[PDB]
């Protein structure tokens, strides 16, 4: 069920009447980037990895010495 395109997925489940080639220019959302469609990669090695979006909250000191 993961291999169906999003605009078609709402149609197969009886959400919309008009199929996504039948809908006019006004409903197609404006984008500034390409579309690529990853279905689901569960068990596949292309499974998602979560991580920290930001850096550790408290900085540590860069060691700087001084000969007196």
């Amino acid at each position: 069920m993961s291999q169906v395109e999003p605009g078609w997925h709402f149609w197969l489940g009886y959400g919309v009447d008009t199929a996504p080639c039948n809908t006019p220019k006004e409903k197609l959302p404006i984008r500034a980037y390409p579309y690529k469609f990853q279905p689901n990669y569960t068990g596949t090695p292309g499974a998602f990895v979560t991580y920290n979006t930001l850096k550790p909250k408290i900085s540590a000191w860069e060691p700087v010495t001084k000969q007196r």
């Binding site: 069920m1 709402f10 197969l12 489940g13 009886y14 959400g15």
Partner: protein
């Protein structure tokens, strides 16, 4: 007051024919026999999805 056996409109023969010939058992049998001959409800899931409202989450 609940009726005794003697103040009943059914005869003993009429009442016990329904007893030994299982009348309403056969009626309830014939119900599901009627249901053998009708259309099932099953949809085939990855080929056919069920309901969607846009409110769904």
């Amino acid at each position: 007051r609940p009726a005794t056996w003697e103040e009943s409109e059914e005869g003993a023969l009429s009442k016990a024919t329904k007893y030994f010939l299982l009348a309403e058992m056969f009626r309830g049998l014939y119900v599901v026999l009627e249901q053998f001959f009708r259309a099932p409800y099953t949809i085939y899931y990855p080929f056919e999805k069920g309901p969607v409202s846009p409110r769904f989450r």
